[PDB]
Design a protein around this nucleic acid. Structure first.
Ligand code: K
Ligand code: K
Ligand code: MG
Ligand code: MG
Ligand code: MG
Ligand code: MG
Ligand code: MG
Ligand code: MG
Ligand code: MG
Ligand code: MG
Ligand code: MG
Ligand code: MG
Ligand code: MG
Length: 235
RNA sequence: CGUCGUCAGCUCGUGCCGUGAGGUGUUGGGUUAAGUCCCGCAACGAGCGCAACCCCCGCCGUUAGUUGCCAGCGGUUCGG
């Protein structure tokens, strides 16, 4: 909530090419063939976006964090492992929202296999199944790590790169789900309901935005939490 | 019942794409006897198949000696 001047490394966008003309309104200028985000409109949209986030959080809503860009995976896996908003980390499976019932059946199988490895039934039906179900539970935890927390459809989704996660965005549009996204110059802002015009490649931009967002979430429900332990992920 | 053919296939449910017939999944890369498995993927699963569970042949044990052996000894018309 104090990120006015601390926006160090967020204004850097993509190159001159690989952009989207619809993003031109959120661009300040072009320095050395690189689009730089308008610093004013950034906070201008941040006001409305964070206000919507606070309203949805203090009402008890659930937000789905989607990140697959390989530069926000380790960040999303813990910023959502904070206040219980679920997340999708390894890859976004087609139909997670429109076919939510089948993926929930997969989650049922996940917790079923978790119950089997908690019961003494591990030794019966010998080692063949003890390896098959082991690998099955492994990949289920690999893909449904954060998704298992969704009992129903989410009330909003959070995206790190709406161009890389365009399928999740489209599915959210189909179900009238609000779309919060950290957009860059390579994305279409019309599809995003609450835009955050920042950088999606840098680690500090993602860490800053997501850390402050989860801090706002926990602040809306009281009990301000300590600073997130995602700084050590700078590496 | 024969046949393609023990050939590796044929489909469904939901989602997604297309005005629609349909497509996706079932394509792809690695692998296998195999749609076998792995990785990737707008797909996620499932059914009939594949394989497995059945039988026979291979090694060993337990249980049991009207089949077997001077393995072990005695008798022997010396033929367990
Ligand atoms: K067309
Ligand atoms: K193949
Ligand atoms: Mg065969
Ligand atoms: Mg279909
Ligand atoms: Mg056509
Ligand atoms: Mg249609
Ligand atoms: Mg079909
Ligand atoms: Mg087909
Ligand atoms: Mg095909
Ligand atoms: Mg199969
Ligand atoms: Mg596939
Ligand atoms: Mg007899
Ligand atoms: Mg006998």
């Amino acid at each position: 909530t104090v990120k006015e001047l601390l926006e160090a490394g967020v204004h850097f966008g993509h190159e001159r090419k690989r952009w989207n003309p619809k993003f031109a309104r959120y661009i300040y200028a072009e320095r050395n063939g690189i689009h730089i985000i308008d610093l004013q409109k950034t906070m201008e949209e941040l006001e409305r976006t964070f206000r919507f986030i606070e309203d949805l959080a203090m009402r008890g809503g659930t937000i789905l964090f989607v990140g697959t860009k390989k530069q926000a995976q380790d960040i999303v896996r813990m910023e959502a492992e904070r206040a219980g908003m679920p997340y999708v980390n390894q890859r976004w499976l087609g139909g997670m929202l429109t076919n939510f019932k089948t993926i929930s059946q997969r989650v049922h199988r996940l917790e079923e296999l978790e119950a089997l490895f908690a019961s003494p039934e591990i030794e019966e039906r010998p080692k063949k199944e003890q390896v098959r179900l082991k690998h099955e539970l492994e990949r289920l935890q690999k893909y449904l790590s954060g998704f298992r927390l969704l009992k129903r459809l989410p009330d909003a989704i959070f995206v790190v790169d709406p161009t890389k996660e365009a399928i999740a965005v489209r599915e959210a549009r189909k179900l009238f789900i609000p779309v919060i996204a950290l957009a860059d110059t390579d994305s279409d802002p019309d599809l995003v309901d609450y835009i955050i015009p920042g950088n999606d490649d840098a680690i500090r931009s993602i860490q800053l935005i997501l850390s402050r967002a989860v801090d706002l979430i926990i602040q809306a429900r009281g009990g301000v939490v300590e600073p997130s332990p995602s700084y050590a992920l700078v590496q």
